[PDB]
């Protein structure tokens, strides 16, 4: 059949790509950094505790002033907190109970949320009246919304469970570019500092690099076993990290197009829900299903600290822009701030 | 200066007002029963009804895909799951339904939820697909319908026990199964749902006090 020859040509191309990557592999990251010394001992304690929500919590996001943050819960509420003084500011009731993601605008004038209704809703905070009401609704996805990240006040990028990603125009309300490369559901995404490229992880155990302007995939990163749950991007601009259900984190390099590190331990069996980096890119923090977080070391791959003290599953994780605080959420209704 | 105290007072007043609203919201939220409806906005559906001044709120998932290993974890804190089965060439849908039931029963985040089972289209209603419908006998305690068809009754009580085996093979102590035959048509299903919900709630408290 004509399908067989095309398949064998694809296999030959895959073999050529694998050989090209194998040729460039001169040394490992461990050997180069074997000379440096360990970070030491890192211990953190809970400085603040927030007790507003009723049901479990799925998402949170930090503000660019590193003082306000929004959180989403499955009872149908959005709450904006003040991190310095534990008092709330806004409480926003949602039309649909199951919200699965939330984002905070860089300017501080908008927030977003989405869930099983397949719709993304934009909320206006600063208004003449003084209340909060929906501005726009973005329909068109054929699957539940799972992540959204503001690019500016007029643009946003979303991922859903119909194996596609889209770029929206808020005032127009119509899709502009669609990225159809994945096979399974898309779980998370992360934007670059210059907001020119971004990466996503799906349930096909693969990650991709997208071009916002052109609109087609440039690189595909493989080598993983199971579904990818979280993804974060490195401060420099040439690396990113992933987390998944096989209890393993990995480090990838855009300019080298290869995997560089693996963060796994023998007694760790549960999955990974969220990952994040530190300000200098030296500490890699992650959340697990065993109710506590871990602090890794990106250059040497050894465990330095542990963030315990949660009564249920940890779902979200975040680090401030100035890097002076860390906030975590969990399936119990409490938020903790660590420093 | 004095403006700082004014800002703090305003912030505390706003906090007090929103806490006062959340108190009423909490009182309203925890007196409602949430049910999930399975089978075999466009994304999600809603439905409200009341029996004996009790609030129910059922959810139908008809806008999603057929890969449900990810969005099914959002229903781990519901009261019960309603599972509709068509008891009637075919493609052996009974085995597919049984496998889905087994997966739901054995899932980690749904390993404590009860299931209410509804067999439908008894009027329309085994020997080729299942080679054990020949050494089976009708259970001693049975209430046959006035139809009195021996083959139909035998098929009914062979299908019910097939689902009961999965439920009794594991998950012993903290969840159960309530099978019903949909002989009643018009409005007798909601009364049954009410009864099972009441039983589940009573058993939950008794288990919490360790009297069962």
């Amino acid at each position: 059949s004509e399908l067989d020859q095309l398949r064998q040509e694809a296999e030959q191309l895959k073999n050529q790509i694998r050989d090209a990557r194998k040729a460039c592999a001169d040394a490992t990251l461990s050997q180069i950094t074997n000379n440096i010394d360990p970070v030491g001992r890192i211990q953190m304690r809970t400085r603040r505790t927030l007790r507003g929500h009723l049901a479990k919590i799925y998402a949170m996001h930090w503000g660019t002033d590193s003082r306000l943050l929004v959180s989403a819960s499955q009872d149908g509420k959005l709450i904006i907190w003040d991190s310095y003084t534990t008092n709330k500011v806004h409480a926003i009731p949602l039309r649909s109970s199951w919200v699965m993601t939330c984002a905070y605008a860089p300017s501080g004038n908008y927030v977003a949320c989405g869930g099983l209704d397949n719709i993304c809703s934009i909320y206006n905070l600063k208004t003449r009246e003084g209340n909060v009401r929906v501005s726009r609704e973005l329909a068109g996805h054929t699957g539940y919304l799972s992540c959204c990240r503001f690019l500016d006040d007029n643009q946003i990028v979303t991922s859903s469970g119909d194996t596609t990603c889209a770029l929206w125009d808020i005032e127009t309300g119509q899709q502009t570019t669609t990225f159809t490369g994945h096979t399974g559901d898309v779980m998370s995404l992360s934007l670059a500092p210059d907001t020119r490229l971004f990466v996503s992880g799906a349930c096909d155990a693969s990650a991709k690099l997208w071009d916002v302007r052109e609109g087609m995939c440039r690189q595909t990163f493989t080598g993983h076993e199971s579904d990818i749950n979280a993804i974060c991007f490195f401060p420099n601009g040439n690396a990113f990290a992933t987390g998944s259900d096989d209890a393993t984190c990995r480090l990838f390099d855009l300019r080298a197009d290869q995997e560089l590190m693996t963060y796994s331990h023998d007694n760790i069996i549960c999955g990974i829900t969220s990952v994040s980096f530190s300000k200098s890119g030296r500490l890699l923090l992650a959340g697990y299903d065993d109710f506590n977080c871990n602090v890794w070391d990106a250059l040497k791959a050894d465990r330095a600290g542990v963030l315990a003290g949660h009564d249920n599953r940890v779902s979200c994780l975040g680090v401030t822009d100035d890097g002076m605080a860390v906030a975590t959420g969990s399936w119990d209704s409490f938020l903790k701030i660590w420093n | 200066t004095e403006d700082q105290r004014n800002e703090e007072k305003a912030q505390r007043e706003a906090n007090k007002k929103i806490e006062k609203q959340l108190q009423k919201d909490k009182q309203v939220y925890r007196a409602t029963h949430r049910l999930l409806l399975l089978g075999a906005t466009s994304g999600i559906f809603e439905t409200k009804f009341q029996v004996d001044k009790v609030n129910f709120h059922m959810f139908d998932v008809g806008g999603q895909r057929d890969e449900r290993r990810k969005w099914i974890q959002c229903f781990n804190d519901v009261t019960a799951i309603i599972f509709v089965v068509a008891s009637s060439n075919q493609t052996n849908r009974l085995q597919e339904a049984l496998n889905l039931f087994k997966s739901i029963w054995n899932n980690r985040w749904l390993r404590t939820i009860s299931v209410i089972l509804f067999l439908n289209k008894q009027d329309l209603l085994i020997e080729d697909y299942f080679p054990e419908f020949a050494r089976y006998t009708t259970p001693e305690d049975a209430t046959p319908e006035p139809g009195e068809d021996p083959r139909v009754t035998r098929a009914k009580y062979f299908i019910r026990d097939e689902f009961l085996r999965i439920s009794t093979a594991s998950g012993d102590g903290r969840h159960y199964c309530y099978p019903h035959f949909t002989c009643a048509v018009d409005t007798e299903n909601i009364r049954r749902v009410f009864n099972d919900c009441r039983d589940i709630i009573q058993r939950m408290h008794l288990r919490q006090y360790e009297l069962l």
Partner: nanobody
Amino acid sequence: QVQLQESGGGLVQPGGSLRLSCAASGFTFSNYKMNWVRQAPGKGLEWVSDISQSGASISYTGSVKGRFTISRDNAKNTLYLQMNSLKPEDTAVYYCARCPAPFTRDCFDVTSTTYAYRGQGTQVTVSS
């Protein structure tokens, strides 16, 4: 990358015997549970059988119960299916698949072709 490749499909008259196998790579074989899946012409996907991590637990679909058997080799990362006394009804395309999560007793893999962790299959036909 996860990859599966089946082999051993061939035409056979009624009463014959066939042997099927698929070899896995790119993941730890011992940590996952395997299945067998068929697709009849003009009909949807149908689950056939499954085997536990250590091979202790075995299940069958009822139509083929008592005629098929399944075994796995952890050392060589290979799955086997033994077929005896075939009939013209058995003609279909056979797939071997695994469920996505390790250390789990529940799997969701009888879905459409969209399932990523599946092979390509070999044609098996019975006629005269």
